[PDB]
PDB file of C-alpha atoms in Angstrom:
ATOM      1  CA  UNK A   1      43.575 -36.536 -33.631  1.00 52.91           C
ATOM      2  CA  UNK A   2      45.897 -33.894 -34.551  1.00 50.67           C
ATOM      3  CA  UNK A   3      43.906 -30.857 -32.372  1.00 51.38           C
ATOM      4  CA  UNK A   4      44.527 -28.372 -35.067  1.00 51.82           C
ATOM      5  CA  UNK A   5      43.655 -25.062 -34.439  1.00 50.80           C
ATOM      6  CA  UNK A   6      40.480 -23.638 -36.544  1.00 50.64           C
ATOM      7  CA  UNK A   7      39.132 -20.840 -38.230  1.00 52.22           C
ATOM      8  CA  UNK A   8      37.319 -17.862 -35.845  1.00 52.40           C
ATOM      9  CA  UNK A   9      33.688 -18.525 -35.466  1.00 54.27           C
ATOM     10  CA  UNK A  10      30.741 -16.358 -37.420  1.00 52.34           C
ATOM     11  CA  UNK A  11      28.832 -15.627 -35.057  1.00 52.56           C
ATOM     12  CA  UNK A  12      26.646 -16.823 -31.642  1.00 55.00           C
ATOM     13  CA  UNK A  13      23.531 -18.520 -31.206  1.00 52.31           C
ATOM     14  CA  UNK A  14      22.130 -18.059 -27.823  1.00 51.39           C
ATOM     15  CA  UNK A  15      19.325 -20.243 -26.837  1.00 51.39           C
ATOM     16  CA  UNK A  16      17.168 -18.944 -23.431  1.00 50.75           C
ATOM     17  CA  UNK A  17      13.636 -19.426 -22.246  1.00 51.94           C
ATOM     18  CA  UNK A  18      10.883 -16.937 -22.965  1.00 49.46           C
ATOM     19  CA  UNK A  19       8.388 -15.237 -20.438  1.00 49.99           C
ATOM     20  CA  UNK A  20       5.092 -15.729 -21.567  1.00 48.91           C
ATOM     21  CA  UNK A  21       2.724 -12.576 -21.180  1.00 47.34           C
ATOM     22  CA  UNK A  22      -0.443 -13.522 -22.451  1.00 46.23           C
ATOM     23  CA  UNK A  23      -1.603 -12.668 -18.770  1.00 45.84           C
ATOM     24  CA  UNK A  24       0.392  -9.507 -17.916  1.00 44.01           C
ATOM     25  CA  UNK A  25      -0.532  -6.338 -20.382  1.00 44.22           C
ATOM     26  CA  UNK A  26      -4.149  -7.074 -18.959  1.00 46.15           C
ATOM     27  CA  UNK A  27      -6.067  -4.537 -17.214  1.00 46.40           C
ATOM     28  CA  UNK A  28      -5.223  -3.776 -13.630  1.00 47.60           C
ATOM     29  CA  UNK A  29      -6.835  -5.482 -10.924  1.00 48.42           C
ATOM     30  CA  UNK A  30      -6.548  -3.336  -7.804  1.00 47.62           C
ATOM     31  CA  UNK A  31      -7.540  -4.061  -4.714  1.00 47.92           C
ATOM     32  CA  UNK A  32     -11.117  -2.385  -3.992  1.00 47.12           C
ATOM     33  CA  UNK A  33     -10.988   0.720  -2.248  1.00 48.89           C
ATOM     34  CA  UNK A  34     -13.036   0.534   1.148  1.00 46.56           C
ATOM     35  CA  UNK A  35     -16.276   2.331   1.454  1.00 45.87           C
ATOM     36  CA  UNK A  36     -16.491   5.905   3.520  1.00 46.22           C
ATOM     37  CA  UNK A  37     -18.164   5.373   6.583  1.00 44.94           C
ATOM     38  CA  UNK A  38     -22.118   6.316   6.038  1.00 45.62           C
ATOM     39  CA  UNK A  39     -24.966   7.162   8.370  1.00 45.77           C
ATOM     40  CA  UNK A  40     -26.664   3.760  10.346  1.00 46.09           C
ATOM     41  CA  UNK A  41     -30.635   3.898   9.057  1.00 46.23           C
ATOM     42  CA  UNK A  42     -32.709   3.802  11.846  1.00 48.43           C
ATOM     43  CA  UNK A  43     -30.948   6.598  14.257  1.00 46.06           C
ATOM     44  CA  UNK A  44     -34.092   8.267  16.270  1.00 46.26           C
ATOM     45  CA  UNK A  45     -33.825  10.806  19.134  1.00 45.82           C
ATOM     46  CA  UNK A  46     -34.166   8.088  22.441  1.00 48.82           C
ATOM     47  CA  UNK A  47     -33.116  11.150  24.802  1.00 47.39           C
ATOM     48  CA  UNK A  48     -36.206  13.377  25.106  1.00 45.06           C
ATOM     49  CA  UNK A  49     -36.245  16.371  27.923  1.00 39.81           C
ATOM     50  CA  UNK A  50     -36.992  15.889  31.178  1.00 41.17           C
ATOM     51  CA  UNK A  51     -40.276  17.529  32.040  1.00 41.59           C
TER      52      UNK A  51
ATOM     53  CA  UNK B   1       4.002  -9.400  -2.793  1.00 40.12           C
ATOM     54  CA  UNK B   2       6.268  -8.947  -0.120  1.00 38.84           C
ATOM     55  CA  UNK B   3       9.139  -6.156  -1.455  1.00 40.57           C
ATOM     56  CA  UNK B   4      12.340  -5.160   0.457  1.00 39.49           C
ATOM     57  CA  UNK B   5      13.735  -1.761   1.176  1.00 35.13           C
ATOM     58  CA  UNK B   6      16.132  -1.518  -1.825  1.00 36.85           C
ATOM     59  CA  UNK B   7      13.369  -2.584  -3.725  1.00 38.65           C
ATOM     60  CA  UNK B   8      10.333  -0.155  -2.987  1.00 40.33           C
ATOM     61  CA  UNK B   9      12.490   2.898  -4.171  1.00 38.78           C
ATOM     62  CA  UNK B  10      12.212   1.703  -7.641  1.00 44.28           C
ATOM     63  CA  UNK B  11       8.465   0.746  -7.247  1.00 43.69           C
ATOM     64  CA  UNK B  12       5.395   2.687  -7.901  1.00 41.39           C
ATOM     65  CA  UNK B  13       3.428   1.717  -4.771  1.00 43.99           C
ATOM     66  CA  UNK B  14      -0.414   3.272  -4.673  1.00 41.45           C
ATOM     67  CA  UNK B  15      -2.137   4.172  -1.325  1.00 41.71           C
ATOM     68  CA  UNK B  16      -5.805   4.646  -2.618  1.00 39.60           C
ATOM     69  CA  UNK B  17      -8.079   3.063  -5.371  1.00 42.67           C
ATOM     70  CA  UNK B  18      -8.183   6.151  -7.135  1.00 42.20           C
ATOM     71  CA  UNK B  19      -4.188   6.849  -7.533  1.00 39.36           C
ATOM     72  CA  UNK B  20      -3.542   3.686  -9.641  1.00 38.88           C
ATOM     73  CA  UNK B  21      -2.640   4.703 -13.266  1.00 37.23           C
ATOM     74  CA  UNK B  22      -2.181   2.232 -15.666  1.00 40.27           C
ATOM     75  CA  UNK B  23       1.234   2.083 -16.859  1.00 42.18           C
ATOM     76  CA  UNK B  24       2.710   3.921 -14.057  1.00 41.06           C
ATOM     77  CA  UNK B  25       1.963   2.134 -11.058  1.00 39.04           C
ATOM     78  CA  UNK B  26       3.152  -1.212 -10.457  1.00 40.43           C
ATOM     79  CA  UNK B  27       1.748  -1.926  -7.174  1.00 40.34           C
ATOM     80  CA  UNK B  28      -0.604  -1.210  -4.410  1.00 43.91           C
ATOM     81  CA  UNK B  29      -0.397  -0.861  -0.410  1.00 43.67           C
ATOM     82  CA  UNK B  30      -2.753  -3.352   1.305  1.00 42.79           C
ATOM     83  CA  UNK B  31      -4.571  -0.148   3.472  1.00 43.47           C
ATOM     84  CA  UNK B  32      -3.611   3.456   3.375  1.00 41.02           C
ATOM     85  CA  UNK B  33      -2.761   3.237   7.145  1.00 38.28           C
ATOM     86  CA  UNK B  34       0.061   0.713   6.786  1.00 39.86           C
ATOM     87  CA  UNK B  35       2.407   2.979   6.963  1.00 39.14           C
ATOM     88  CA  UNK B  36       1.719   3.361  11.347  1.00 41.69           C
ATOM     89  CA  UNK B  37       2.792   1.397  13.616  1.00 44.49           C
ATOM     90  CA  UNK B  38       0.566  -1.127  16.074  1.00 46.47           C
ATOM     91  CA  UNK B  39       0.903   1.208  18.523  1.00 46.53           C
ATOM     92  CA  UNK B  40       0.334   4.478  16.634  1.00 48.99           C
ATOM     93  CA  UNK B  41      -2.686   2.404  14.812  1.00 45.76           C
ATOM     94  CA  UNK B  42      -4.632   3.068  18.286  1.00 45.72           C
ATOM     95  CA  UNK B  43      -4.560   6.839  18.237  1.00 47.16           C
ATOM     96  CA  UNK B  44      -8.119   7.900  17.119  1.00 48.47           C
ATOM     97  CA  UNK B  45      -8.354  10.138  14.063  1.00 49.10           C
ATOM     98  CA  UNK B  46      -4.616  10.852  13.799  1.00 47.40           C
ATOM     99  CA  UNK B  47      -4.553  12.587  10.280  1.00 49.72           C
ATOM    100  CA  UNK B  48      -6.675  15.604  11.976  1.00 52.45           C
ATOM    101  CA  UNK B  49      -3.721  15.919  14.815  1.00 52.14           C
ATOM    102  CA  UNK B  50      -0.563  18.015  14.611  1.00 54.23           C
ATOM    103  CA  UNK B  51       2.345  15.357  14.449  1.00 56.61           C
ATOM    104  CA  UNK B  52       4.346  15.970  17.334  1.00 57.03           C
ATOM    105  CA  UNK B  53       0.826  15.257  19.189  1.00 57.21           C
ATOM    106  CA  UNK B  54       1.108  12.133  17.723  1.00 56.05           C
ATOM    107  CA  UNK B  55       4.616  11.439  18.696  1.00 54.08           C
ATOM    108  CA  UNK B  56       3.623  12.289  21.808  1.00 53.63           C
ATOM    109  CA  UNK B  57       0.444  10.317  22.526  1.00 54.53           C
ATOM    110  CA  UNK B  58       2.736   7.254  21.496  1.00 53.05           C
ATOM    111  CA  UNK B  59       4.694   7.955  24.409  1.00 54.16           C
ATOM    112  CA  UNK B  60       2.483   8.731  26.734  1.00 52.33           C
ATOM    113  CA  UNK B  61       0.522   5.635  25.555  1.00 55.07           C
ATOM    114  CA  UNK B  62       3.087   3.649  27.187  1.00 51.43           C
ATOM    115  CA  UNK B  63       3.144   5.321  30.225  1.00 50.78           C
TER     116      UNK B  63
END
C-alpha cells in the first residue's frame, strides 16, 4: 500500500448512450393543409322581382 | 411541440402545407393565422386590409 505514482494513461474510453433513429430520417408527416372554401351545392335564386 | 423564443430563431417553422421541404424544415405552425392575436383573430378578411387599418380596428374594437 505504498500509493506509488504510475505511468500516464494511453488513451480514453468513453462509454454514452446512443439515440436510436430508426424512426426519424422517415418521410415527413405534416399536418394537412385545410381545404379552400368551395361553393355550397344547392344555391338557387329564392329572391325573384316583385311584379 | 411547444418551442421558446430563443429557440424558434434557429428553427425552420412552415406556415402552409405546401412550404415544407424535406431537409430544411423542421417544423410546422398549427394554422397560418397563429401569428394574430384573439382579438385581431375577429377582424374579417384582414390580409386584404392596409395594416394600420388593422391596428386600428383593434382599437376601436375595444371601444
Amino acid at each position: 500500500g505504498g500509493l506509488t505514482c504510475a505511468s500516464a494513461p494511453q488513451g480514453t474510453l468513453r462509454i454514452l448512450e446512443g439515440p436510436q433513429q430508426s424512426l426519424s430520417g422517415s418521410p415527413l408527416q405534416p399536418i394537412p393543409a385545410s381545404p379552400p372554401p368551395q361553393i355550397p351545392p344547392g344555391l338557387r335564386p329564392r329572391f325573384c322581382a316583385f311584379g | 411541440e411547444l418551442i421558446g423564443t430563443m429557440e424558434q430563431i434557429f428553427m425552420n417553422v412552415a406556415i402552409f402545407e405546401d412550404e415544407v421541404f424535406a431537409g430544411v424544415t423542421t417544423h410546422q405552425e398549427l394554422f397560418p393565422h397563429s401569428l394574430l392575436s384573439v382579438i385581431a383573430n375577429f377582424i374579417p378578411f384582414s390580409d386584404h386590409n392596409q395594416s394600420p387599418r388593422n391596428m386600428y380596428q383593434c382599437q376601436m374594437g375595444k371601444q
